[model samples]
Target: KGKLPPGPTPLPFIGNYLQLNTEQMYNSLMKISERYGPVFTIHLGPRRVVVLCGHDAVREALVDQAEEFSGRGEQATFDWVFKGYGVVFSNGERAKQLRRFSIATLRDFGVGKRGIEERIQEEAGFLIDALRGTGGANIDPTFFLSRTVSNVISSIVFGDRFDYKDKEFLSLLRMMLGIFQFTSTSTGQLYEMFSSVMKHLPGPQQQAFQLLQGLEDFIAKKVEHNQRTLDPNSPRDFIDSFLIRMQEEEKNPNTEFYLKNLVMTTLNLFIGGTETVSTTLRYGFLLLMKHPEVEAKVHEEIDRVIGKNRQPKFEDRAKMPYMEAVIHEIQRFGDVIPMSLARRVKKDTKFRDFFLPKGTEVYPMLGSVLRDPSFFSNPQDFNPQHFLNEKGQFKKSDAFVPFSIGKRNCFGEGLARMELFLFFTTVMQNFRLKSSQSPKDIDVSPKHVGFATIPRNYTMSFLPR
Candidate 1:
């Protein structure tokens, strides 16, 4: 046997499936890492994966040995839906090309510029109006937050934002949410274990497939709409830009900018863009309600730096240190995407005294990095000072990698960070969030613990400032 990293002996067909709590997979992996050291291999139902834990381990691989650890690993959960297409799931040259194209196209449409800031500021107003209509009644912030975030991505991708009450928008949003929510269910885990067999059964996983089909068709419809309305002299949005690319490369024998890539890549951005930020906002609000003192400090920062009369600009983040620290703490404490999208070793690599062959899957345990005691004083608690210094200024941590790190790091990181600041500060500036339960009694634990760590559902009222 080649000297691979040491791990629990994998059983024949099941491998270490029985050893893992698939529902709360990250926690289980951390427990194993406690015994096996930072770099060790485990068989996830016959397929082997090396999980990297702690700030040092994760950074060493994702940052130090970046290229060797940059390939995207396949997952039964999304591989069926994504089919190896799109920016999120593809590997090798295709991934490199799509990522370059995506980052450039998003920038062309004003992702990291003042133009995007104006769009978010405008969307923030619409969100404020919708919340205001709730009249101080308690409601779950899930769809409300998702719709606002979804519209931001939708506008950039499709060239328009749908009204909050638009049936088509709501339906598509519901489908995307349903797909993610399905991933946490027991039925969903079964599919990951034995997708070949599960595909034959009638269950929630099947329903999720239906949702995926509907979601795919929606993108297909948008492509058609963009095709008819597209003016070559003046392209509209992300889709039009891609359609233009497709035409430019039609004669080439090899072109990644085809209709399939367009639809799937657009779907990737739309789903990836909407869920993570909105969920973070949902979790951030929950944390604020639970820790009112932190909320009070953020509110004070807003009043002093941004004031009540004007909208919160992305630039305001530079002046508002406490607000910046608070947002960073929420992401660190919330630990969304606890384990990053699985990675594959791009070459036969020597990693931290262990040898890994090409195509070995890797899990950079982000929760371990966020919660590492070496970086945070009390890694388990909800404290904002993790991101603050002695002078009460915003302190940056190399371990703070919610959007992940390295070459394949999130394509939407620029847009997400800006939106997190603008949307969160804008909402905080306008309203006092009230939870049904008192601060001490409230639980901020995630409802789902697998793939994406999601916050538990809670109802709250928004009181206008």
Candidate 2:
């Protein structure tokens, strides 16, 4: 028997689910950490989850001992959703191979290069045109940002982009948004914890599952079309490259490149690529509307560095330090994924003062680090100075880890950064965001806060500068 860390006493089966606030899970976890050190174990239903709070504790586990803490924990919700065929849910050799290949493949298709930037700039133009059609009326920016972001990733994955008004594309996006909302609700958490029983009951979980299957079918059809016209001589996109790899590895007994893997990995890219950045952008604009001074500063920087003669480019970011700082603060304040994807221990080992066994599920509380008072002077407020130095230059902090750290960090960091900078600066250059309500009356706090932090629904007008 091994020693476990301290935590609130768990019941026979329900664990601490009844006592903890499932809606604001990260806040609940932080409170528990305040009472029982940084490293403690809590039970979610019947599962034992070791919580790693603060920067020092999280870094020690995820970075210092990377290999020992590299395993991905199994979640009943994701198992039902992804079915153990993708990079996000798979572990060990298959996961490693898929992740390495995905990173290389994305890079090859211009993730950090000029090619991807060009695609994003083009999509931003479409977004501008769509917003212009609104004629300065109050509009919900949700689907507007979603369509733009989805098309950026779609260009790489499917070698094309859909029109913003396409019926089928809009339906697919609605399905994705539905799945996101359902998964963040209290009922969703219960379903994940008690999936064995929840599977038989009827609720939003069933609706979410149905939507996932619809998305999977859509991706499968795209794969089938790509396979029919695939050419080994010259690949068109990510799907073509994956198909060619599968053909080459058909004879290898241990190959992880297969149809199901490709479908699931593509789905992972589609969902992840679309959601987080767009949500951050949406939240950033809300903050800008609430604090018009911050918005004015960003506009000033864009006008000074990049005049109205041309669109903002990736290189223009360095010349606009204030805009960059605002973007950084937006990400930090947003805290999109509060409780990061769960990780498991590779083997039985001594971590801090506790003995953690192999396969013990661990949660690195990213919210704690993002909001740590020691790192930022005013952690609760929305201030750009958190990322600026005395000279007003953009400052980098080691504790600012929104994309997480170490081996399992976000694979799309470079791409996501470029998209945020370009989209934000370009939009600020063209339009001024105004909310229907006064700045003081606006509420920027997250509406739902379990798996993800989603801003409440608010309408705003986009006036031409």
Candidate 3:
């Protein structure tokens, strides 16, 4: 074994749990990083985790030594949920194959193409119509936006989009939202720390597992339907594509392409694709309401550039620098996945002065980079100027890593970016969003922070332009 990094010593089974605030673990890690330096270690119960703080350290590990640092770390909660079958939590050859196949299949289904843009535009129209149905009355945009975002991914993955009024569709969305919320709670933290014991106990974590089971059953049924109607020569969506590939590799005894892999992979696409973009949109609007001047800037930009005659296009983004900056700021300030999904060391690696052995869990503090004071001025506040230069042109910073960097960066980054720009611009073009409460009264802080920073529920009035 190599020399482990310096950290707070652990006691028996409960390592660092008592000292850490689970709700604000990122901040806790930051505090510890300040004392122990950028490359240090911590423990979540008995599990030893090496924390990589700030941009330089995270970049060095995730980028410079990508191949050796690309392994996916295991979480007891995730193991129970995904069972080591999908792209997110799986490592080795299986992950490599799934990641490659997924990228190609998603691209084929219009992930970053004009075809996907057209799909998002259509869904934005539906979203606008639904907002108009509210008749300028106060409404919470949570479910409405979630449904629109979910439908976009559904079209790509399931080959169909559900109606806004479909009960089954709404139920599925609620279950997904619930799972995300539960996973970010203190009970969720406890579950992750002691899943084997928690599995036998009753708590919100148990409810989350039940909801997850329902979701799996729903996906399994869809997979069965796809299997029955799959065509080899022509594929409809991701499911059909995977089915064809599974059949092709059926003769290979060592192939990773199979039914279990297909179901979990589809689940990953559905969950990852849906929540992030939707939540970002939700948080972005809240930021606009919090800072009306920013909202007015976006409105003026849209009016001067695209106008109200047509829906917003992906190509229109470059013409509106301020809008682009606002979107970037929203993502930065939102800090969705603050503490990134942990990565495992592929082998004994020497990072900085520390020698990290194989299988050491690494927590690349994404929040540290996104809000790094070195790259961003006034990193704690929400300012679009962070992405804008003196000439008022959009500029990108190396620290703008909402989609983490290197080999295992976000799988659906392109699709998510396109959806955000199109949906956000289209909504701004069609209506003016106003909060029922005063701007000063609205709290922009996240309601919960665990696996993700969950925005609190609020209502707004959408007035047609």
TM-score of every model?
Answer: 0.98, 0.98, 0.98
Number of clashes recorded per candidate? 0, 0, 0
Q: Which runs of model 3 end up more than 4 angstroms from their true locations?
A: none
In terms of lDDT, model 1 sits at 0.88
Clashing pairs in 2: none
**Which stretches of model 2 miss by more than 4 angstroms?**
none
lDDT of 1 at 94: 84
User: What lDDT is reached at residue 13 by model 2?
Assistant: 79
Per-residue C-alpha lDDT of model 1 across residues 1-111, encoded as one tens digit per residue: 258899899888677887788777777888898898987888877678898888898899988999999999976778887899998999988898899999999998899
| lDDT tens digits by residue: candidate 3, 2-31 | 578888887777788877887677778899
